[PDB]
């Protein structure tokens, strides 16, 4: 006979306190961008990105994360 | 005989406190963009992006995340 | 006979306190970008990125993380 | 004969620039106040103030001041 | 004969620049105040202040000041 008892107990805490959060300045690509092109030959796919792209300002008050994985495999 | 008892208990907390959250400035692509092109040959697909694209300001008051996965596999 | 009792107990804490969080300045790509190109031959795929791209300002009040993995494998 | 010519010229500037102004916390009188009084004799005027009074939070974006006085006295 | 020519010229500047201004915490009187009084005789005026009074948080973005006085006195 086989008897499995899976009782994981979790009374955990993930916590943050912040008195104030702010005065955040993100200024990407203030400078001048100049792209001058003459007599170019492309014989395959071209991907081009010019300027200010994909810039992120991420300011969570918390930003706290908990990842928990439980796996019981009987064979 | 096989007896499986799967009783995971979770009394967990993921918490944030923030007194104030703000004064956030995101200014992408303030500068000048100049793209001058002359005599270009393309023989395949072209993807072009010019200017200020896909810029993100993300400011959650919380932004707290919990991921939990439970898997019981009997074979 | 086989008897397995899986009782992990977790009363853990992951905590942060911050009195104030701020006055953060991120200024990527203030300078001038000049790309001058003449008589270029490309016989395969081209990926080009020019300017200020993929710059991140990430300011969580907490940013606290807990990862827990539980695995019971019976064979 | 008396000839007075009063021509003061003022092309002056008083200026401020502020990118962001904020996340200001003023918390006066968080503590407990206990005033226990027994058998007091007052034979003249009494002024009493108890608690949290006359507290100021003053946050001007500018707060710039110019005072100019012109006085011509002929006798 | 008397000839007075009063031509003061002022092309002056008083200037400030601030990228960010903030995360200011003023917490007066967090502690406990206990005033226990027994058998007091006052034969004249009494002024009493107890607790958290007249506390100031002053945060001007500029706060720039110019004082100019002009005085011409003829006798």
Author numbering:
A (entry chain A), B (entry chain E), C (entry chain B), D (entry chain D), E (entry chain C): 305 to 379
From the reporting publication:
pmcAmyotrophic lateral sclerosis/parkinsonism-dementia complex (ALS/PDC or lytico-bodig) is a fatal disease found in the Chamorro population of Guam (1–4), some families on the Kii peninsula of Japan, and the Auyu and Jakai people of New Guinea. Abundant filamentous amyloid inclusions that are made of all six brain tau isoforms are characteristic of ALS/PDC. We now show that tau filaments from Guam and Kii ALS/PDC adopt the CTE fold in brain and spinal cord. The greater heterogeneity of amyloid filaments, when compared to CTE and SSPE, probably reflects the fact that ALS/PDC is a multiple proteinopathy based on neuropathology, as suggested for cases from the Kii peninsula.
